Amino acid sequence: MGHHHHHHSHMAKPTARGEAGSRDERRALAMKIPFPTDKIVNLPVDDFNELLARYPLTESQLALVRDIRRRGKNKVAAQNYRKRKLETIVQ
DSSP, rough: OOOOOOOOOOOOOOOOOOOOOOHHHHHHHHHHHHHOOHHHSSOHHHHHHHHHHHSSSOHHHHHHHHHHHHHHHHHHHHHHHHHHHOOOOOO
């Protein structure tokens, strides 16, 4: 009976990338964000609000964008950090 000799062709596509390997980058491509994480941080609240409304994002995606905005901004907050002290009782 039909001992049919099967055939398969071989292909090869080169994934030419140039990334630094940042944390938020993996967040974006996983939750499928159509705009860069750095832009989310560096843009002001005005442009940021429109940036969200312009792109087809879910409530979960928007939730991520709101966090990433803060994650990158926290690096600037490290310089703009409000210094204080809680009156600690020593022995």
